[PDB]
Every structure is written in C-alpha cells, then in structure tokens.
Design a protein around this ligand. Sequence first.
Ligand SMILES: OC[C@@H](O)[C@H](O)[C@@H](O)CO
Ligand SMILES: OC[C@@H](O)[C@H](O)[C@@H](O)CO
Ligand SMILES: OC[C@@H](O)[C@H](O)[C@@H](O)CO
Ligand SMILES: OC[C@@H](O)[C@H](O)[C@@H](O)CO
Ligand SMILES: [Mg+2]
Ligand SMILES: [Mg+2]
Ligand SMILES: [Mg+2]
Ligand SMILES: [Mg+2]
Lengths: 385, 385, 385, 385
Amino acid sequence: YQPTPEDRFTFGLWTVGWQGRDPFGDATRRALDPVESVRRLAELGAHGVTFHDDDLIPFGSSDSEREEHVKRFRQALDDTGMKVPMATTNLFTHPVFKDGGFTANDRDVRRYALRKTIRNIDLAVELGAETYVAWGGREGAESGGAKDVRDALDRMKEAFDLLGEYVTSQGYDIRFAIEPKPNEPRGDILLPTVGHALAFIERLERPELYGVNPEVGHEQMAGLNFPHGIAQALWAGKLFHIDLNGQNGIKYDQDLRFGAGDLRAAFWLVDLLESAGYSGPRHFDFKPPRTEDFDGVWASAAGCMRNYLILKERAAAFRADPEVQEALRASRLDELARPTAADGLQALLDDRSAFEEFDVDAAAARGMAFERLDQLAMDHLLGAR
Amino acid sequence: YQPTPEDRFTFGLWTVGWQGRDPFGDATRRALDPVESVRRLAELGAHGVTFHDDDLIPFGSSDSEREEHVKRFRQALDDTGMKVPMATTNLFTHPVFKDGGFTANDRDVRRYALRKTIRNIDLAVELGAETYVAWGGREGAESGGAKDVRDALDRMKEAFDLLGEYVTSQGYDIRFAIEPKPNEPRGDILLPTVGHALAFIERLERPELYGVNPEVGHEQMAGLNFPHGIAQALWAGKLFHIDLNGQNGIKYDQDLRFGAGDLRAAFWLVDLLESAGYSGPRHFDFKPPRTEDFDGVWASAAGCMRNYLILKERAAAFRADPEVQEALRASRLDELARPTAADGLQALLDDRSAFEEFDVDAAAARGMAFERLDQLAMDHLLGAR
Amino acid sequence: YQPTPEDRFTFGLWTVGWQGRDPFGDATRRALDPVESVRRLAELGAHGVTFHDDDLIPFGSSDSEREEHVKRFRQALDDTGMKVPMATTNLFTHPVFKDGGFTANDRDVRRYALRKTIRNIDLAVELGAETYVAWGGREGAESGGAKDVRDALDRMKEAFDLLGEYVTSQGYDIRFAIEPKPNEPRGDILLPTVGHALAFIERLERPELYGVNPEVGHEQMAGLNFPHGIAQALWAGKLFHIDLNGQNGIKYDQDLRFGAGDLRAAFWLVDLLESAGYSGPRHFDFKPPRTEDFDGVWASAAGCMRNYLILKERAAAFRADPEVQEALRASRLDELARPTAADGLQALLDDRSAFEEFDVDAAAARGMAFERLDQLAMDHLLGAR
Amino acid sequence: YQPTPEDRFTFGLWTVGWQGRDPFGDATRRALDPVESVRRLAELGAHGVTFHDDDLIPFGSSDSEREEHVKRFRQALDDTGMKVPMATTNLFTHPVFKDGGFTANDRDVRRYALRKTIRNIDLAVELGAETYVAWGGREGAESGGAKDVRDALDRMKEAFDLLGEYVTSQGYDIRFAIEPKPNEPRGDILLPTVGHALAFIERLERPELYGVNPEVGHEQMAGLNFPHGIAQALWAGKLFHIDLNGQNGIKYDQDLRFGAGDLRAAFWLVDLLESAGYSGPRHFDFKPPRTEDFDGVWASAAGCMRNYLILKERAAAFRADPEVQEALRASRLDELARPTAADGLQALLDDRSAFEEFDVDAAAARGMAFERLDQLAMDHLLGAR
Ligand SMILES: OC[C@@H](O)[C@H](O)[C@@H](O)CO
Ligand SMILES: OC[C@@H](O)[C@H](O)[C@@H](O)CO
Ligand SMILES: OC[C@@H](O)[C@H](O)[C@@H](O)CO
Ligand SMILES: OC[C@@H](O)[C@H](O)[C@@H](O)CO
Ligand SMILES: [Mg+2]
Ligand SMILES: [Mg+2]
Ligand SMILES: [Mg+2]
Ligand SMILES: [Mg+2]
C-alpha cells in the first residue's frame, strides 16, 4: 500500500498547513512554508498540490513580492516533479467577504471578487492547472430577509458567465468545478448539495465549461449518500474533480482524514470511482486534528493515501470474486442494466404480460437476496474471505 | 382567517383518510369513504382533493367495480363544486414494489409499474387534473451493492421519457411533477432533494413537461432550507405543485399539519410564494396524529388552512411596512437586484475602482444591518408591531 | 467465525419474525410460528430468544389458549437447549396505548398498562429470564401542550416504583432495564438517551433494581457516540443488557443487522464490551429488510453473529499488538488512568509546579500522537497489519 | 416589551464582545473593553454580566495588571448597578488545553487546569457570583482509541470532587453548574446532554453542590427537545442556571439571538420557566453574526430580551384563557397530574376494573384532542386570538 505519483493523489496547501485555529481555540502549530509542504508531500508519494491564491501569495502583497513567492514555488515543483492540477480563490477569509463574494449584497464587493478570481485564473494556467474550483463558502444567509435567493442566483449566474467569457476570450484550456456545501460558515449556503449545483450549471450560457467538485463530508452534513451523489454526477458527465475526507455524520465539518468517518461509504465510493474509470485527481481536503504536532500531520496525510489504496484492493477483490458475480445475478443487477421497454411504447401497451396477465403475487414473493450480497461485501472489506 | 375556494387549498384523500398505522402501532381510526372526505373538506372551505389510484379504486378491482367507484366520486365532486387538480400513482404499498417501481431490479416489475401509471394518467385527465405527481418512494437502497445508481437513473429516465411520449401521443394537457425525498421508506431514495430532481429533469427528452413537487418536511429531513430550495425551483421555472406540512428537524417524516414544525420557515415560505405570484394549488400532504379521533382530524385540517392565512397576512404586512422597506435598503437588498457588470467584461477588467483602487477596509467595515431587519420580521410574525 | 451458545448471542422473536410492514407498505413475509424461529435460531448457533408478551400470546387470548401457547414454546426450548434471558411487555401496538402506557394522560390506561406488565413479569420468571426490559415507545408527545413532562416523570417513577415493590414482595430474582430512544413513534419520547435514563433511575425508591438497555441505533438517531454512552453506563454499574443493530446516521430507525451502519463504531463497541468483561447477553434487535424472503432473513441473522465475531478478533489483535501498546503510551493513555491529585487538595495548592512554575508552552507543544494510533486501529480493523 | 433589571437578563462579556472570527474567516469587529460592554448593557436594561477569567484578565497577566483590570471592572459595576451572578473558567482557548483540561491525558495539564479554576473561583466570590459554570469544551475525542472514557470520567469526578472540597473548606456560598454539549470543538464531548450531566452528578461526593447549566442550542445539536430536558432538570431540582440562544437544527453551533431558530420551542421553554417559578438569571449566550457592526451587536442583544418578553406575554395569555383551560381538561392533563395507584399495589392487583373488566376498545376510541389544543397555542403565539 505504498503510493506512487501514478495514483494521482493530491493535497491542498491549506490541509497539511492548517495551524489548528477553530471556533474556540488558538493555533497549535506554526505556519508551514509552501516550499516545505511540497517537498514533504513529494517524499510521501503525492502527485501534486493545490492552492488558494492567498495560501501562496499573502493577501496584500506587491507585484515584486508576488513574483518572488511564485518563483520560489515553481522551483520547488521543478525540484520534486510535483504538479499543480487545480487551483482556487479565497473568497471567504477577508472581512470584505462577510456577506459573500459573487452574491454579496454590495455591488462593489461583487466586482472585486470577480477581479480577484480572474487574477488567479491567469496564475493557475501559468502553473498548469486544468481545473479551477469555486467554493462559495460565504454565499448564503443566517436569516430569511437578508438574501433574496432568486436575485442571488441571478448574480451567481452572472459571475460564472463572465468567468466563462474570460477563459474563452483568452483561449485557456481550463474548466470550472463548483463545490457545494450545505452550511458552515453561513447558516445556509447557496447551492447546498451536488444536485443543486448540477441543476444550476444547466442554466449557464456555456454549461460544457462547468462541472462539480463534491466533497465527502459536505454531502454527509446533509445526511445524504455520497456514492449516490457521485453516481449522479458521473451520469451527467460532470465529475471534474473530487475532495476526499471523512465526517462522522450531521454536525460541524470535521475534515477528518480519508477513511475515517463512514468507512463503508468510503469503500463504496472507491468501488464506484475505480469501476467508472474516473481519471481525475484524488484530492484530499482534510485537516490534521489540532491535537497533533508535525509528525502527526504527516502521519495523517500518509493515512489518507494508505486507506484509499486498501479500499481499492478490497473493492477490486469484491468485484472479481466469482461468488460475488453469482450473487449480483441472484439480486438481478443484470436485469437493472437492461432496458425496460426497448420494444417501444405501443408494444408495452399491447403486452398483456405487463399488466392484464401479470402475476403480482408470484413477483412479490421473489426475494431480492440483498443481505447475502451485502455480507459478502462486508467480508471483502474486512479481509474475512 | 376563513378559507374560501379561491385560496386554492387542496388535500389528498390519504391525508385526512390516514387510519393511524405506524411502524409500531395498529390503526386508531376506521377507514373514510372518499365521498365523505370530499363533503367534509368542502364544508371546511377547501378548493379540491387529490388521490392515488389505489385511494380511489381498491387494488385488484374489476372494471365494473372501478366504474362504480369513479361514478360515486364524480357525483360528490358535482354535488360540492370540488375540483381534482392533481393525481398520482401508488407505486409503494403493494409488496411487488418492495425494490421500487420504475427502478426495480426485476424488469417485469418495471413494465408493470409503467402500465399501472398510464392507466391512472387516463383517469386523471378525465377528472380534470392538470398535474400528475410522481413520488418514487421505493426507488433506492438499504445497501451499496443492491442498486447500481447509474443504471437506475437510466431506467428512471427511460420511464419518464415513455410517459412523456404517451401524454404527447394522446394530446393530453397535463404536466409531471417529481417529488424528491431523501429517505424513508428506503434507506436512501434516488433524487433525494429538489436540486437532484431539477438536475435529472434537464436530461429528459422533453424537459418542458416536467417540474418538481417539493414537500416542506422532505427537504427538512436533510436539514436544508426549504424557502431556499423553492426559490431555486422558481428561478428555474419548475415549481409546478407544492406539498405543505410540518416537520421538527432531522428525524422520521412526521407529516405534521402546516404551521407546526419550523414556524419561521413557514413564514418565509409563504412570503416567497405570495411575492413570486405562485398560482398553483396549496396542497396539504399531512397526517392528523393517531392520537386524534375524527373531530381532531377535521380540526387539524382546518388548522392547515388557518395557519397559511395568518402567515399570509403577516408576510404582506412585513413587506408593506415603510420601516421594513427602509431596512431592506439599509441592508442593500436593492443592490443585490442590480447587475454586477452590465458594462461587460472588458469594462470590468479596465475599472481601477474594482481592484487596484478598491478600499477593502472601508467596504469591510460596513455593517449589513441584518439583525435589525430580522427583528422587524419577528415583530411582524408575532403581531408585535 | 462460527458462533456457539457460549457466545451468548440472543434474538427477539419480533426480529426474524418481522413481516415487513412499514409506514408506506404492506407485509412482504408471512408470520413465523415462534416454535419455528426457536428451532432455526438454534441451528444458527444462537444461545437464546427474547419476547414481548404479545409476540408469544396473541392479544386477547383466553387462559387455555395462553397455556397452550406457553406449553408449545417451552417444548421447543426443551428440544433445542435455547434459553430465555430477557422478556418485555408490548405497551405500544394496541390503540389503547396511543398516548402511552405508564404516562398516558388517561389514568385508567395507566392502571391497565401496569397490570399487563405484572402479568408478564410472572411468565418471564417462570421461563427463567433474569432481565425485564421496558421500552416506553409511546411515552412522549408530538406537541408541547399535550404532556406536562414533570407530571409525566412523576407517573413514570410511580410505575417503576410499583413494579419494584411487586418483584420484591414476590421474591423474584429479576432486574429491570430501561431502554431509551429519542423519537419514533412519538415525535419526542421521554428519557430519550442513555444519560436521561441513568439520571431518572437515581430517583427511584430502589435504584439497585434498575439499569439500562441501550440500543446502538437509538443513540445514533441523536448523533451521539454509542461506545461513549456505554462507557458511562458501565462506569455507573448499570449496563444490564444491550441491543445490537446498525443505523446510518440521523434518520428513521433502520434496525439494520449488526455491523451495518457505522462499522468503526461497531469495532469500538466490541473492544469496550470485551475489555470491560461484559457478561450479559449479546442481543440483536434488528429487522431483516423487507426486500428479503426467508432465506435472506436467516442470512441477515447469521450476519449479525458473524460480524460480532470478526470485530472481536480484530479488537483483541489491536489490544495485544506490542506496537499498539507502545502507541498507547506515546499518547499518554497510561497517564489518563493515574489520579490527578492523589496527594490531596492542600498539596495541589502548594505545588508551584502546577501553576506558578508550569511551562504552558512546553506542554502545549507536545503532540498527542492520536492519528498514528488511529491508523493502527484502522489497519487492524481491515486486516492490513 | 421594555426590559428592566428585575427581569434578571444577563449576558456574557464574550457574547457582545465576539469579534467575529470563525473557522474560515478573520475578525470583522474590533475588541470591546469590558467597561464599555457593562455600560452599554446597563443602558439596554440588562441586570448583570458574566465572564470567563480570560475575558476579564488577559492570559499571562501579572498580579498588578490583574488588580488594575479588576479595579476598573468593579468601578463600572458600581457606576451602573450591574451585578455578576455567574462566572466561569476558560479551559479551551489556549493550546495547552487541546486534549482537555480536567480530562487531558497529560497529568500535569490536569493539575494546571484545576489551579487555574480555583484562582478564578476566588475572584468570582469576591465579585458576588452565586453560580460557577463549567463547560468542558475540550473534554472528548475525535477518535476511539485516544480517550478511555471510564478513565476520563474518573478524572472528571476527581476534579469536581476536589473543587467541592475547596469551596467547602473556604466556606464559600457558591454552587457549580455543569454545561453539556454534544460536540464542537471536539468530535464528541463527554457528558453530551442534560441527561448525561444529571447522571454524572449523582456519583459526586457532594451532589447537592452541583446542578446543570443547559443551553438551548446545545441540546438542539442532538435533535433533542429542549423544554423536555429542562423539565427533567427541574424535576430533579438541578436547574441552577440556563443559557438562552437560538439554533436552526442539527449543524454547527450557531449561537443565534434568543427567539431565532426554533421559535415554537422558545415559546414552550418560556411557558415552562415561568410556570415553574424559575428564579435564576435569564442568561444569553449568543454571538451577534459577523455580518454586523456595533450597531447590529446592540440591536441583536436588545432582541434577545425583547423576544423573551413577547413570549412571556403570550404564554401567560395562553395559560389564563378559559378556553385553553377547558381544552386542557378535554385532553386529560388534569388526570396526568393525579396518581396512578394511590390505593397501593395490592389494591391495583385486586381491581377487576384495571384488567379483567377493562374495556380496551372504549378507551382506545377516545380521542386525545391534542390538535385543537395545539392550534389554540399557535393562535396565542401569533396573537390570532
Ligand atoms: O469547506 C471548505 C471547502 O472544502 C474548501 O476547502 C474548498 O474545497 C476550497 O476553497
Ligand atoms: O412521503 C410521502 C409522500 O409525501 C407522498 O404522500 C407523495 O406526495 C404522494 O405519493
Ligand atoms: O425501537 C423499538 C425497540 O428497540 C423495541 O424493539 C424494544 O427493544 C423492545 O420493546
Ligand atoms: O459552546 C460554548 C459554550 O456555550 C460556552 O460559551 C459556555 O457557556 C461557557 O464557557
Ligand atoms: Mg473541499
Ligand atoms: Mg408529498
Ligand atoms: Mg431495542
Ligand atoms: Mg453556554
């Protein structure tokens, strides 16, 4: 279970660089220089790193300070062979974004947010990113009267449309990925789940440029099934990126290392990504707990990759087991994949076997055999086959 | 707060007719004849009733028994002036639907579900319904291996496409409304929220025929904000119907009368529907608690309509108050409604006032004034102005 | 992973006998004769069965019919060597209990509930049960004004006190176990968690006769940590019985087979029970999903026992690993077990090393090493050591 | 709805002084001098203020700086007539407390936490506080192996016992109030609800010195009913203090102003406190949202008191309405308050009317009339009577 760069494991600078400040506590770790994080992640077998603008260039920097920060970063990438497959903008930390960026009630803040984003799209392309993520963490409300959501969705569509116009006019080869979250830090966030994000995208001027970046813990904060949501994003052709972590149910976002939280969900998620041939980055958006020193930060990071690789082994074993393939036929997964009425509507209507002569009692008596199938999955996960 | 038929309040036969059977308990009330429910609801000031096929025609009935049941129902409608604006199919009670209807793993069950649906679309049109609802309550899974969700979504698209082909071929003037729910009775249900349903619709062959039927309590079982979800459905032009009830948070579906549960949410929901000019039925999909006799059933029903009408009064008072209109301008709701960059992308990029000369500290210091606005809303809700 | 009767695995008659009726669906399985369930569970390696009165003697039976039902049951126990370690009363299915049993607002219902309970305590002792469980599934409310909770707790204390007086007067060797649940079927149930139940017990006349019967899924419906709750019940000396199942988070009670739901929680629960030397029954209170026929019912039951035995192996391996014992010392679990101030209060106050000369920065810099410890636990659970 | 000091409304210094730092954002407001907060709260009609040690004396201060800070604070109290009814310790912000205070795995940290607490108990008594609150916000775990909960509860009992020994030895007239919370900032916190706290108290050496300080939003983060929990704390005689705020369901702790969140819960909470004659402080533990400037901070604070006073009016009107008193008798709330079996156990057993001659069908047919009662409560809350 040793990772190599071909496994496409990536990490944000803000993940291992989290200093441990929380709602009730000061930092427990000092700040990490991005150059150090690049070197240490390369040693652990990572493929690449991601960044918000402000992780890499401290807010307020001059053009000369900005150039120095980039130069040093690019040298660390050259020294390690690390890639940058994705970048994003910080439109949530600075006080100016307290009511949002793209959907701030103040128009001047909206225009600023757009300019800050465009400046970092340029840098992202320079560094070789192919996906630009957008997490609207401040887009929302704590109270009903503060945000007219129809107007806010008009302003969110206006912003993404302008960004699509910019990337096309410049000829860049980069696509956008919208990251939903249901709440935190706002009491409710706009586009709160994968579904809302998918639906919004279909009303953009150039929908082909936009997909989703779902995060395990975010969908779990709404109690939803994360592998099901990913299945719908794949079905729509919109899974452009994914953020992997863990979460123990409906509560604050924990950002535990991947494999922690709902372990069975993590197994079915890896089964799906590997079966569907997802070829994008396996990005970990996690926070080493603030109980840990730097040795525990790197242990937590290594654990993310290790657990993905164990689960991949076990899901492949499950799908290759002749006994499991028999069990899938016993539960009629083969029949689910066949069309209901390839013969057409008129044929269906004239088929007495579909209604007038259908024996509903015979059909109802047939067991689905799902519990034997799920115990074989459990036995495979635990290495008890 | 006396309702009249012009208020467009409707009720399902299964709501006031719920006999009180739950996971742990037998029925506490005897069955109601649909004719009685029509008469009693008319006396309370309702506009109309809705039905599943099997609420009106007991499952397994002959064509002669079916005709007698319809004849008697139509006479009660004629005797009272009650309308039938919506109908739906029961694809969840009979054992044959234990793994679903449209997405059952068994193909023969899928074909049966379609034929049972088409038979009731014919009856719905005969009785004058303009919306046909589809709640896939059995579409889903308790375990990961039982349902390949990509295949299931193919089968769900195939079914809705065939239904769209049927209504077009027959020339009917009826539209479909998909009702999402996150779980119960399946451990996870497919299309679990308004967003997932909206996104699915955009992949149907004839998307214009399909909208959503959201239910208050269903979105609340995922902890989501129901007025926000409705705002997105309106923004997409897909709010074809709505189910009104109450729910106390993330737990089993309670189906409390409307106004119970999250009262502030109910206020912001009525504010939105009335402001947006929603002209569809105000449908109550609720269950009088099984502690009640028939006097309490009718009291609970009357309470649904009463609470809508109080909330409508209070939301209109809130929006008409000069002090509230001032407060909305103080919180920049006016600026939210104005375009971010009507001047265009190039103008935005050349505007030094949007970035190079923007004072982020001045902008960050401006309070949003949302708490004074929300206390005026509270004072209006409570009649404390 | 073959179970034997020494593993003390037990099952309720209502578990494998669940016919599959849910809020939205009719039964999918026919009724099982208790004699058949006893025989089939013995073949699977169970130790014993449990029962509600009404599972064994249909409600309304005569004394002669009651004697016949018991006689046949006792013969099946004699024929198989199965035991009955626990029994309980059904105070939730019949309509008379729609507002509760012990805390029904109607006094005559309260008195009936007590008499029905006492009649079955007699039978429980005759059959050899040592624990009598009480699940107040109807004790609670859907609305605030319906139940004065102080008065209700007086009536619940009065009922348990009378039951304690009965068992002492008759000289029975049986103890009571109160089963908390937060909601379902009532909108909120009284004594909703292990903690509330433990606190209530300390106000009974004879607290030594009463403990708790916690259920995995019940505490999980409140988002709580089930191994922590059991740890507190053990610490108080009140873990008299336990109900094992699975649950996927905060939603309706699923009653999945044990090992399903939160698998990591199930691992830490078995670690604790085995480490603490819990010697009581391992009782499964689960429902085979209504998708299954009878072959799937017995597969689901076997799976309960299998998963407990795998988890027991893995938790014992974890605790016996020298590397894990080193890791426990690295995270100071040894120091947690030592007294804070065995030297006493005055010594603590005079110790300059506890405040005046304490280096808070040195202490704050020490990492806890919890993530390496938790990755060793994960590696042990998955068989990746 | 003008508050006066006789209404006993109090506020923590940390509430209106919250600068707006959250998991994802920097501060939006500058720090408030405690002297200013005392003066501004007095102008709004508050009765008093509360404090953590470190709110009033910056961490690390010298004895001379400490004396200056106290002197200035006491002058502001003298200048305004504000009281200090409660104080508490900060055992959660400094990095040294990252694994807890009283239950830290490191013994030296445990001893430090105790000394820091005792130093502030002395100051609390000097300033006239009668209640000392203890919120163990860092007592818990993110992972199963990190904390043996039986050992941790031994260390938590040891700490409270030592504190009880200190206050008795010094002869102070002050009592302790334990504040439960289910999670945040730890993934699970020990003593997560009112019930767990009540049960723990009964195992302390001197239980009479300890009660609970429940917080609205904390019990709501577990989906529990807050008025029910308070009813149990009152029933045990352990409601020593209460923290009032709002929360929108199961999610991160929002700390909204009181009246926001679950408004119907807030109504039933005020009904109960006033009916039970709770004579303690009405303490608001809330955070003005970080969207607000200082004008919005004071508006939010005023709103807390205003909403309590509206709800008090409406609950008193509800209880005084002859129609509601009739409705309470119709739902048998009178019978709930009468003993079940004052005649004794033997009389109950010999009463044929309690079992042999009880008509369960007649009793089951009686409706409870709860929905008419709850619509009268709603009409009273909304001022629609
Ligand atoms: O909840 C925080 C989000 O997960 C962010 O880390 C986005 O992925 C990037 O801004
Ligand atoms: O949760 C149950 C659903 O709300 C149904 O009542 C649909 O509206 C109609 O089948
Ligand atoms: O939620 C249902 C409960 O778990 C019952 O099965 C009790 O254990 C016994 O009445
Ligand atoms: O969740 C935070 C808690 O509510 C604290 O404010 C305690 O009341 C005091 O330390
Ligand atoms: Mg992310
Ligand atoms: Mg509905
Ligand atoms: Mg149970
Ligand atoms: Mg508090």
